[PDB]
Design a protein around this ligand. Structure first.
Ligand SMILES: Nc1ccn([C@@H]2O[C@H](COP(=O)(O)OP(=O)(O)OP(=O)(O)O)[C@@H](O)[C@H]2O)c(=O)n1
Ligand SMILES: Nc1ccn([C@@H]2O[C@H](COP(=O)(O)OP(=O)(O)OP(=O)(O)O)[C@@H](O)[C@H]2O)c(=O)n1
Ligand SMILES: Nc1ccn([C@@H]2O[C@H](COP(=O)(O)OP(=O)(O)OP(=O)(O)O)[C@@H](O)[C@H]2O)c(=O)n1
Ligand SMILES: Nc1ncnc2c1ncn2[C@@H]1O[C@H](COP(=O)(O)OP(=O)(O)O)[C@@H](O)[C@H]1O
Ligand SMILES: Nc1ncnc2c1ncn2[C@@H]1O[C@H](COP(=O)(O)OP(=O)(O)O)[C@@H](O)[C@H]1O
Ligand SMILES: Nc1ncnc2c1ncn2[C@@H]1O[C@H](COP(=O)(O)OP(=O)(O)O)[C@@H](O)[C@H]1O
Lengths: 557, 557, 557
């Protein structure tokens, strides 16, 4: 199978992941079938033990992975559904080899980092390239590999040795190489320098790889004498020094690389069966990148969250949301409100943090409550859901918002004010949200409801059955532990809020739809991760179709 | 003698020379006596065979050096007068050792680049540190050394080996080390990274030097957690990671390093006799850097030249000129006019390049004609000097402008139109500007008039004797070959233009002063290189005192 | 033209020059025409200003070069006659570029070590590869290049950069690469390690070359799992890790590389027109390497010299001498006698150094007096030439021995005891050996008689005309300044010693032949450098044909 290894150059925050995924979008739209194996230098096996603030935004796969943020970038720029071993971290090999040396699967033999780690990386990438990562069951054709972290650092050393020997496991005509590099410049001088691109490739050749492409990233597009300079010091023709300047969007990055004629390069370098025509489906990525800059209308919806800033921590949500806003022709102004700032605590001790966050909630024409774990920042979002019910703003709750809306509906329309969850003050007077972990035969104890499960509708007049396309069942990614108590359906028999979503065996309720309000829905699943920039996530479309008035006319065609 | 070795880090155009000279200005203004030995990676022995366009601006010393542009930066930030061996280039050692291996001064012994080049660098810097580079004859106390070019390049390899062994020739407490480094950042992210500072110091330690200071250069001032990161990977305390951001002037660079507390560092690192008080003369550099930003008035003088742009090529002139403009409180708008664009050739073939350059000459209230060699761009400047004589704008001619003004005065007030030079159409009908090279006993042939020579005034009503301070003689740097013909003094006996300057033995005329015009003077010497930012060059002051009307009131006190 | 670049690996004294010349002997004996350009890291332009003790043995070319010892190794393993620019030293480029920057042949432009040195190396090797280095005037076909010194040292840095860019000036199929490496082992362990071969190639790839062959040099032949290890870490198939163990001779090194199948490798790597047959003339090198180990007879001749040991300093002579001893089937025991130890000084102050050196002279059956400059060690060799005349041992004088024999013949058969040279106590009572430098039109002053000149015989009964093949004239390399005085032919008209050799214009006498003694001849030229291992140098053959009695029977067929 053909292999494309991107690898970093001078510094860290270049944009490997937008380069590596945009090599995917080209060869996805050339007809070829693409996988993606993002290498990670960090140690976190089954990575989602993080704090989303740090790191950012634990991503969820179909099988139940707790996988890196930047693996979500492949499942949008392609329609790929990745697997939990289709990520690979440093502490995933070292756990895989320590588990093999204690079984005795090496027969003594004094296991080493060469070759017994570098074989374990190469056995990994020979296998996860083969698994059909599209829904179409067929062996794939290329494999973009993203070696995270820079080079010359001391986590590249187990991996660039592993891909040093991997040039010759495959043939020369099966293994390309991308080296994304920083080409800085100073302001008042204008000279666009490229010393560190020289000293990074010299560090790269000493590690055993030579760049086939050298993707220089700058502020302005690099001069034609600059790429003539890199051609002499980095052993490649000047047609292969691709620039990528300060792009105004991520959607322009695939159409920018195509005009740099990379499609013609991978035709001869990897001998791929592209063909020679209009070189991709330019009619999708450019046809929306023209729409992304042509945005002058505003659907400024709010997003109350547990965290102080958008150091990303909701990248996924943000992304789904735009995906809707690209299909409605609206520049989305995401007002990020901290949930702590709306509490009763804040107005006593610090009114400026209080009122400035509330003022954003008043001007907003959509509240989104995403997922989250813990008592922290909970009591603020309970004020915001009451602001959606008593002032008629479109609302969407995701995996905690569905839980907290059903809690506050009992507090404010049923006056069951003592009802709470069991995550929150666990010895519950009225146990409305209880714990109910899963029991799948094959593990021990209470497992999280995690992965693709089935969700069955109940009624016919569902505003989500209108959006998903009148289908009986949907499949979305779950990540939680808790449910609404089935012994509180008795208190929910006739009033405004009712249940629409339900799983297979019926013990757990999924989707709510409040009456006499254009949009008040809450989901147990995460609608984010099934979105693409082609098809929006259907709950996120209805949150923006109701945030601009088009929710009426959308449901008349 | 104490030694300070600055050395470059990530890229080329950082600003070694403004860092290395600002370490000079601190220790000049701490009471210590400073030298400067700029290393150069290039090969040009007796360097001024360049084209000023390329490179830029051949600088002139007292003894007759043809020395680098960036050695002029030391003779302004200090009152130092440098010597021609106080520069050192790669092709100056290799010529010095090839000349010694052919005499036999090594006694066979198979001379090598280690040690016989690295000794020749160390014998050089042990000697030129000792020579009193100030006018005060006394052995100096420190020696700033500027290793030009980056590190890890293959000209550092002869020199960083030469300073590797030079740590131990001197004691530990005689040899500091500065490593100026690039700390880039990307725009929309804000992360201020410092990977290449790590990999440059690792390259530096492998070459045998460890940084005592690490001067990180960025756009914004670097965060206090960023310099905490460099402290762990580059083996120095966090108080020694000095930042230098996008400075608005070069004069702020010395006062910016002082607030980073470098004076306290070199007190303990080098055991220098500074003292503890107001740590420098802050009352000079800050007291003009406040004046440099407080400039709202304009003295927009023109500068017609042979070259297409100010890729620097007149840095010296530019610099002298501001030095005057700092003392007059005027932001100098240097309009750079190309001499080719004012010719009769240009208006025929390309009127836009013609009129846009002339339009600058009409709005200007000062014409400066600097030095230059050749027929190219000569006929354009002859139109501009006629524009100074027939429209009464203050004028200054420097070393070709003095020659061309005396030529055009004969063409337009004496109607000796056939008179020209002997550089230009050499078989002269009327030889008004002839060749007259020097004959100093000790060389063979016609030497250039080059270096500090004596210039004696003739009259008493000189507008330059008013400016230099009524002195009988001045000493300025010469660099030319040609003179005005002494057999054309007969045609100059009584009219408007007369001669004021004269050398010792009287064969050669120096300085002219036209009557019935506030400022029309021309000099054979170069007034630029004797200027400081404290004392302006006195011809350049009179070109700006007449460009704002203050030439009257300056000569009444 | 095809190019083969050998380059050193771990340490210095590996044997580049025996590897690089043995690649020559293969492709010489495959039918191809070979040149040789030995790079040198040292600085000595026109290198023979050395002391032969240091360094060793200034070699002489046809045109008048004063060239490295190790360029003589190419003129024996091939019949090549090298040129003085067909060597290249570091101080030959730097002098070539400093001479071009002062003429102005770069037009300013700020000459640099990249590219203006690396172009000057590549312009050099593109030119001296083209010059026909064989006597057959025809453009050659390959070019062995010996980059002296190790790699990662800071003289490789100007040259491995120069051959980094030179991979792409030529095509991929015109530039091979040899990397000769050290594979050490420890005694009692037996493990044959190859860590430094890995870290040298990683240093080599970071410099920009990849090894096509990796010639590992050890004590024992390296194991077949060791070359399997280098194949994974140095990017070449295991058939290309050539071993070379502790060879018993230098003549086995060409036939050892052939059995490692290098001829089959350069057929596909460089696409050379070899053919497929008996892969070389194995019938020459193996057919004498079998003769070199089959030597049990002894022709132990003496060699009195100015130097304390054979740190080589007479490599050339030594080599010529064996070349004769291979054709006589005698293991040559070269007894090296110091000339100082035979003096009257030594027996007074130190009898052990005296008698042990004389005892060697008494047992010896041949005295050779080679060339040399100076009064030092002269009076000892005058005792040894008297030991050849008064005790009838075969003698040969070379370029000082011809001078000193004619001196001592006047002292001991003519009793002109006051006669001496003019090098020695220059105000000569009887000037028998005077100075007579050449006057070639094109230089100034007294030039050395240097290079190929013509030597014309005088008589018919010459024991050298018997040896050279009854030819009228011979051509041999000269390197001296002095002659025998033509005004002392009057004192030489009739006695035992007479003159046989003579130049063209007759002023200078060359070759002497003493009567009533089987072999007492002396030459002004150096017979050494025209020898091969196929044809011996004809004076050195007659010194060994008379040292074993076969001088009679050789001259009867
Ligand atoms: N890879 C390199 C590049 C340059 N040099 C030497 O360093 C000098 C130029 O240094 P620098 O400005 O750092 O190289 P540039 O390529 O000009 O820098 P940039 O990458 O900003 O263009 C040249 O004379 C050259 O001899 C070197 O030894 N090795
Ligand atoms: N000198 C270093 C720095 C980092 N790392 C590894 O690389 C990862 C981080 O890489 P990078 O982002 O390049 O390092 P930072 O210092 O975070 O980058 P910056 O200089 O931009 O702060 C860390 O997990 C660390 O294990 C390393 O091996 N060697
Ligand atoms: N660290 C070094 C050592 C030597 N050289 C250069 O390489 C030549 C000598 O090379 P080499 O023999 O490898 O160095 P030695 O120290 O003599 O080798 P050894 O370690 O065997 O003594 C010298 O002219 C010197 O200019 C260099 O650039 N860097
Ligand atoms: N294919 C993609 N789709 C969507 N977002 C992306 C994609 N690639 C990168 N991004 C986002 O853009 C930012 C670019 O930084 P990134 O490429 O992650 O830096 P690095 O090169 O260190 O991985 C990231 O924070 C990431 O969240
Ligand atoms: N001490 C100084 N005085 C005046 N001008 C200076 C001084 N130092 C630098 N400059 C000018 O400012 C610019 C800064 O670039 P420079 O420091 O020369 O880069 P580099 O670090 O590659 O030498 C130079 O072009 C130089 O002309
Ligand atoms: N082709 C050759 N012919 C004759 N003698 C040689 C040849 N090559 C090397 N030698 C001799 O054998 C010795 C081997 O060392 P050498 O190859 O010179 O080490 P290095 O690899 O450092 O040049 C040298 O001293 C040299 O005199």
């Amino acid at each position: 199978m053909k292999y494309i290894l991107v690898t970093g150059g001078v510094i860290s925050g270049i944009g490997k992941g937008i380069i590596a995924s945009s090599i995917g979008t080209i060869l996805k739209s050339c007809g070829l079938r693409v996988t993606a194996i993002k290498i990670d230098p960090y140690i976190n096996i089954d990575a989602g033990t993080f704090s989303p603030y740090e790191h950012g935004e634990v991503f969820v796969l179909n099988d139940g992975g707790e996988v890196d943020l930047d693996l979500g970038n492949y499942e949008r720029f392609l329609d790929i559904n990745l697997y939990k071993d289709n990520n690979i971290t440093t502490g995933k090999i070292y756990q895989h080899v320590i588990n093999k040396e204690r079984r005795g699967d090496y027969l003594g033999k004094t296991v080493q980092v060469v070759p017994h780690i570098t074989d374990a990386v190469q056995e990994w990438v020979m296998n996860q390239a083969k698994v059909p990562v599209d829904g179409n069951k067929e062996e794939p054709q290329i494999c973009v590999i993203e070696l995270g972290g820079t080079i010359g650092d001391i986590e590249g050393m187990p991996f660039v040795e592993a891909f040093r020997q991997f040039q010759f496991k495959a043939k020369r005509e099966n293994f390309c190489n991308i080296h994304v590099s920083l080409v800085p410049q100073l302001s008042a001088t204008g000279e666009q320098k490229t010393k560190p691109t020289q000293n990074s490739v010299r560090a790269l050749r000493g590690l055993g790889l030579s760049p086939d492409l050298i993707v220089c990233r700058s502020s302005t597009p690099i001069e034609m004498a600059v790429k003539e300079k890199i051609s002499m010091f980095c052993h490649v023709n000047p047609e292969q020094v691709i620039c990528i300047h300060d792009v105004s969007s991520t959607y322009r990055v695939p159409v920018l690389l195509e005009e740099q004629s990379i499609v013609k390069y991978f035709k001869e370098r990897l001998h791929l069966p592209i063909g020679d025509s209009a070189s991709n489906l330019l009619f999708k990525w450019r046809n929306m990148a023209d729409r992304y800059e042509r945005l002058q209308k505003i659907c400024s919806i709010a997003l109350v969250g547990k965290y102080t800033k958008l150091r990303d921590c909701y990248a996924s949500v943000f992304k789904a949301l735009e995906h809707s806003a690209l299909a409605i022709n609206h520049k989305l102004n995401l007002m990020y409100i901290d949930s702590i700032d709306l509490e009763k605590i804040t107005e006593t001790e610090d009114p400026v943090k209080f009122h400035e966050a509330w003022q954003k909630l008043c001007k907003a024409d959509g509240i989104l409550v995403p997922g989250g774990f813990g008592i922290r920042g909970t009591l603020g979002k309970l004020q915001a859901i009451s602001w959606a019910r008593t002032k008629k703003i479109p609302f969407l709750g995701v995996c905690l918002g569905m839980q907290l809306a059903v809690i506050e509906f009992a507090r404010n329309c049923l006056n069951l004010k003592d009802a709470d969850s069991t995550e929150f003050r666990p010895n519950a007077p009225v146990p409305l949200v209880i714990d109910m972990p899963e029991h799948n035969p094959g593990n021990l104890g209470g497992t999280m409801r995690l992965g693709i499960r089935r969700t069955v509708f109940k009624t016919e007049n569902s505003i989500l059955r209108k959006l998903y396309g009148d289908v009986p069942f949907i499949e979305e990614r779950h990540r939680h532990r808790f449910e609404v108590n089935p012994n509180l359906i008795k208190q929910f028999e006739q009033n405004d809020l009712s249940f629409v979503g339900q799983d297979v065996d019926g013990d757990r309720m999924e989707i709510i739809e409040l009456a006499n309000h254009p949009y008040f829905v809450g989901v147990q699943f995460h609608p984010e991760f099934s979105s693409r920039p082609m098809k929006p996530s259907p709950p996120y479309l209805g949150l923006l179709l109701a945030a601009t008035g088009n929710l009426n006319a959308y449901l008349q065609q």
